[PDB]
Amino acid sequence: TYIPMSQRRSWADVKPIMQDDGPNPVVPIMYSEEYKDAMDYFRAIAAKEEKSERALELTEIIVRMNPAHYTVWQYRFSLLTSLNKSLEDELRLMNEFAVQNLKSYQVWHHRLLLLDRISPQDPVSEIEYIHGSLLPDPKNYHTWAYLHWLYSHFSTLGRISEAQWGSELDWCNEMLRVDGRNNSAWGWRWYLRVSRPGAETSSRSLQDELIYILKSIHLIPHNVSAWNYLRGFLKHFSLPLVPILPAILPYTAFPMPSPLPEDTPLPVPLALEYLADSFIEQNRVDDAAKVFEKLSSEYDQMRAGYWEFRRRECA
Amino acid sequence: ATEFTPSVYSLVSKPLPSNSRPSATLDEQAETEDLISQLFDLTADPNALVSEHGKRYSGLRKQEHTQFLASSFFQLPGKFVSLDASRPWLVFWTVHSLDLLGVALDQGTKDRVVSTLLHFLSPKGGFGGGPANSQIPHLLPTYASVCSLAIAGNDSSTGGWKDLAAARQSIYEFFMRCKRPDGGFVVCEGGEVDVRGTYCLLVVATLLDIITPELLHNVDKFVSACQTYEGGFACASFPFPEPSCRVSMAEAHGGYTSCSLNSHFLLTSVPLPSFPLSIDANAALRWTVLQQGEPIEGGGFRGRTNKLVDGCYSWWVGGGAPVAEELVRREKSRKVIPPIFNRVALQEFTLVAAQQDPGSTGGLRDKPGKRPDQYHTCNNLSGLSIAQHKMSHSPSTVSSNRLKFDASKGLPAVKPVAPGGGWKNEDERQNARREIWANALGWIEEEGGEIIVGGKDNRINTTTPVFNILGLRLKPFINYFYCQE
Numbered sequence A: 001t002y003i004p005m006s007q008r009r010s011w012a013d014v015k016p017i018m019q020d021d022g023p024n025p026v027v028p029i030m031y032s033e034e035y036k037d038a039m040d041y042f043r044a045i046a047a048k049e050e051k052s053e054r055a056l057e058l059t060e061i062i063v064r065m066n067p068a069h070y071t072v073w074q075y076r077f078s079l080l081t082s083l084n085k086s087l088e089d090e091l092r093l094m095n096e097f098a099v100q101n102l103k104s105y106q107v108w109h110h111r112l113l114l115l116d117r118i119s120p121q122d123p124v125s126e127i128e129y130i131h132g133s134l135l136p137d138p139k140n141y142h143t144w145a146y147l148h149w150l151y152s153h154f155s156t157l158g159r160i161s162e163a164q165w166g167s168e169l170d171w172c173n174e175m176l177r178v179d180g181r182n183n184s185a186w187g188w189r190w191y192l193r194v195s196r197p198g199a200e201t202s203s204r205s206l207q208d209e210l211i212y213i214l215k216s217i218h219l220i221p222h223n224v225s226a227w228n229y230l231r232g233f234l235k236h237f238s239l240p241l242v243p244i245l246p247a248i249l250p251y252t253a254f255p256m257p258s259p260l261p262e263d264t265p266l267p268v269p270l271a272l273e274y275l276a277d278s279f280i281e282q283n284r285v286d287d288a289a290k291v292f293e294k295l296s297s298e299y300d301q302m303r304a305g306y307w308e309f310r311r312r313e314c315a
Numbered sequence B: 001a002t003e004f005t006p007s008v009y010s011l012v013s014k015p016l017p018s019n020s021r022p023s024a025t026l027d028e029q030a031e032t033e034d035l036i037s038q039l040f041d042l043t044a045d046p047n048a049l050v051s052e053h054g055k056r057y058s059g060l061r062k063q064e065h066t067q068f069l070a071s072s073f074f075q076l077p078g079k080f081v082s083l084d085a086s087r088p089w090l091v092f093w094t095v096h097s098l099d100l101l102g103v104a105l106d107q108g109t110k111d112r113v114v115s116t117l118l119h120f121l122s123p124k125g126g127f128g129g130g131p132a133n134s135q136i137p138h139l140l141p142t143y144a145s146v147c148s149l150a151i152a153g154n155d156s157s158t159g160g161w162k163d164l165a166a167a168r169q170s171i172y173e174f175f176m177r178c179k180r181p182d183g184g185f186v187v188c189e190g191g192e193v194d195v196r197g198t199y200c201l202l203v204v205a206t207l208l209d210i211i212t213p214e215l216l217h218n219v220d221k222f223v224s225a226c227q228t229y230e231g232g233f234a235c236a237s238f239p240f241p242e243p244s245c246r247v248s249m250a251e252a253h254g255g256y257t258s259c260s261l262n263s264h265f266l267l268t269s270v271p272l273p274s275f276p277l278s279i280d281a282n283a284a285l286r287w288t289v290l291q292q293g294e295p296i297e298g299g300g301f302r303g304r305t306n307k308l309v310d311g312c313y314s315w316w317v318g319g320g321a322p323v324a325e326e327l328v329r330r331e332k333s334r335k336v337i338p339p340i341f342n343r344v345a346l347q348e349f350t351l352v353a354a355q356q357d358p359g360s361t362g363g364l365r366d367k368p369g370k371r372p373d374q375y376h377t378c379n380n381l382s383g384l385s386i387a388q389h390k391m392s393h394s395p396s397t398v399s400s401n402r403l404k405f406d407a408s409k410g411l412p413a414v415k416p417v418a419p420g421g422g423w424k425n426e427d428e429r430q431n432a433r434r435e436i437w438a439n440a441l442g443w444i445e446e447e448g449g450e451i452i453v454g455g456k457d458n459r460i461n462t463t464t465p466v467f468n469i470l471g472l473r474l475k476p477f478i479n480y481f482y483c484q485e
């Protein structure tokens, strides 16, 4: 049975404050006895701006019931800094939250704030945790965004070694080996290989990247992730499409296509987009328009309107 | 009108090819393809004259959806505590859906909506996810509350619009407290930084006439750098050490692409020099159209590459299409008509797959197998509206707006945080007021552009791109704050 906080001697000095909903509010929630009681006392605690251990304990009670309660999370971090609490211990609690399936924008942001403040000299153990946390949830958007932040923030502090970057690429390669259709991992590859300030982008480095991309395409010809990466790569480095065309041409009917893998019906819509864009590069607008028309009427009819727009843009 | 928008039923439905490489992504995809295609097979083609015998009827069950929204509008069970910090969204999702469904609230109920939301307003500025004595202000419920007040409020003493006008300075100050030097905003004190915050802030600032140069500095650069190699936009960009370079921090997503395109569009009507920093509109358009699913997955939109189709992205991705289209149009005109997405297929996804099965709770949903909710009800319907009605931003309408604008009418100018943070002079401020107001009211329903799949009984009202409220709500609301009534 639940013991009301008004009956607890630890809270006797606190006068709870009721929720100020006003008369007959819309969308009211029938709060549980526990949640209402906790919020009544939090309202009082926060109004008086008490920074104490009981206030800290109370914030944990509330966020367990509602992980998205941003006000309480804001108050919790203020409590951690005011009381000079062990932030490493708090990180361990956040790990437990993930295991207990308690998640939100707020939990991930709280984690960011903790790592920012702890500011470890080597963030390897946190990087390792994040990798492990992606196993049951390989596409969790918050986790991927956090990983980007972690490497970005700590690299500005000069705290990411070349060995650390190397193992990160190794890990990303394994993720893409496990699931080549994981677009989140492709996005992480782009950061590691293209967009990050320290990315190695020499002539031979671009050659190696092209090889990797094409081999990914030849392995999974219908993988939209791989095609978007190819097109993004050539566009970013202002590389002509024509010299790579022999590797893509078989999908419209450097590493070349495999007999093609089984269950690979032709043509691949994005291979046709490539072919059409290569015609535009050659100033062959009529040939380009012909491909867009085929995409519109036969090979990618869902986007009939869009491909017609691209066709008209040639004429 | 439908030449380039083939019906799902007129196309061949085949699974996404495996290329003989199985993966977790494909396992989920094939399973979802099965769920959606099987429901399409059980449902009568909405376009057919002879609605075949024994098959489920796909008509929009407006009354079921009205009952769904009504049954949770006045009381929510204890489990909804997960959305206690999102109660203004529960308000917005309901009142906007009812607007779209053409269901009027009586004045008494409207007054309750106003009262509920006004108690969420802090004197220091901004709305929170609950009462001011319970929750701190936050950019997202500020958007949700402001839009809800546009929908349910009025210009009388009990209508709430008066309260917003008085709160203009404090709301502006809250916005400035959220501002970071790189152009990002925290969603709340000590909160996360992403383009949802930027979008929600820019909508409210536009509507209430509280835009200044200091509020917008670097905001364009932050958003522009969210664009990924895929063409869509990520949650945020990281400023590398004024900054040497800005880098996108995750995948292009429908939600963040919606917020980014809309944010950028709002910024284009602010006449600051070399502002806003350009985005790649064609890449954004390409990404948008590529997220429309194949016939087997019902022509609904997915939120990101190699993920699943979901009814809510009809608004987030579909509703970004007319914005991207307009930006592409402007760019081609700067250097120097068929629909750009399958408007028919999207309506078919909504009618066939996104509605709750008949004779039950009602409401609209993510996909078959998922419980309907308020969030999906609102976003399915908002997306359906975009598909049904051809919305365009009209330069001639904007020109007509400019001609009727009265600069001598307006509320007191906000006092900037920094002495030089305001407009250079009154002429430049008034020119900005005119541009912001004229462009905000530039969206028109194209004559002859209407396509209502399944017949006119399926027609819902026309939402406005960028803002996502009805034009009939937007006009008197913005006119009130700019004193253009």
Ligand SMILES: N#Cc1ccc(Cn2cncc2CN2CCN(c3cccc(Cl)c3)C(=O)C2)cc1
Residues within 6 Å of the ligand: B086, B089, B196, B255, B310, B312, B366, B375
């Ligand atoms: N924000 C956000 C968000 C995050 C993830 C998603 C992904 N998504 C897609 N379909 C369902 C979802 C899960 N969403 C439901 C709505 N929602 C929410 C709550 C309060 C307000 C708003 Cl607008 C939205 C969430 O936070 C989580 C969608 C939206």
Ligand SMILES: CC(C)=CCC/C(C)=C/CC/C(C)=C/COP(=O)(O)OP(=O)(O)O
Residues within 6 Å of the ligand: A139, A140, A141, A142, B140, B196, B199, B200, B253, B254, B255, B256, B258, B259, B302, B303, B304, B307, B308, B310, B316
């Ligand atoms: C104005 C405002 C508040 C806009 C928000 C827009 C929006 C829909 C954002 C989604 C953000 C996000 C982390 C999605 C991933 O969720 P998921 O992995 O559950 O969904 P997924 O599989 O479709 O990507």
Ligand SMILES: OC[C@H]1O[C@@](CO)(O[C@H]2O[C@H](CO)[C@@H](O)[C@H](O)[C@H]2O)[C@@H](O)[C@@H]1O
Residues within 6 Å of the ligand: A046, A047, A049, A071, A074, A075, A076, A078, A079, B136, B189
């Ligand atoms: O977290 C408490 C801590 O934050 C501050 C500002 O840094 O106040 C914020 O939190 C209070 C409790 O929720 C609110 O009343 C206030 O509006 C908000 O700014 C500090 O004053 C407080 O110690």
Ligand SMILES: OC[C@H]1O[C@@](CO)(O[C@H]2O[C@H](CO)[C@@H](O)[C@H](O)[C@H]2O)[C@@H](O)[C@@H]1O
Residues within 6 Å of the ligand: A265, A266, A267, A298, A299, A300, A301, B011, B012, B013, B014, B015, B016, B017, B294, B295, B296
């Ligand atoms: O078999 C491929 C061939 O069929 C078409 C339609 O005639 O596309 C169908 O099959 C594709 C899978 O290979 C699906 O992606 C698509 O949704 C479906 O219509 C042609 O477009 C394609 O060339």
Ligand SMILES: OC[C@H]1O[C@@](CO)(O[C@H]2O[C@H](CO)[C@@H](O)[C@H](O)[C@H]2O)[C@@H](O)[C@@H]1O
Residues within 6 Å of the ligand: B001, B002, B046, B047, B048, B450, B451, B452, B453, B454, B455, B456
């Ligand atoms: O399509 C234009 C216009 O025609 C109407 C009837 O006036 O519906 C017809 O067209 C729809 C879309 O092509 C079909 O789904 C429907 O079966 C057919 O009657 C209007 O609803 C529509 O706006």
Ligand SMILES: O=S(=O)(O)C[C@H](O)CNC1CCCCC1
Residues within 6 Å of the ligand: B060, B061, B062, B063, B064, B065
């Ligand atoms: O929301 S809708 O599906 O459009 C409308 C509801 O199904 C109501 N259907 C009634 C059943 C009994 C006879 C009168 C009609």
Ligand SMILES: O=S(=O)(O)C[C@H](O)CNC1CCCCC1
Residues within 6 Å of the ligand: A042, A043, A046, A047, A071, B122, B123, B124, B125, B132, B133, B134, B135, B136
């Ligand atoms: O000064 S104002 O902002 O107008 C009014 C107070 O600050 C409100 N503080 C609340 C205390 C309880 C938790 C949520 C915040």
Ligand SMILES: O=S(=O)(O)C[C@H](O)CNC1CCCCC1
Residues within 6 Å of the ligand: B059, B454, B455, B456, B457, B458
């Ligand atoms: O206005 S039109 O599009 O020509 C035709 C009507 O909208 C058809 N609506 C149906 C009426 C009978 C019950 C099921 C809906």
Ligand SMILES: [Zn+2]
Residues within 6 Å of the ligand: B310, B311, B312, B313, B366, B376
């Ligand atoms: Zn959804």
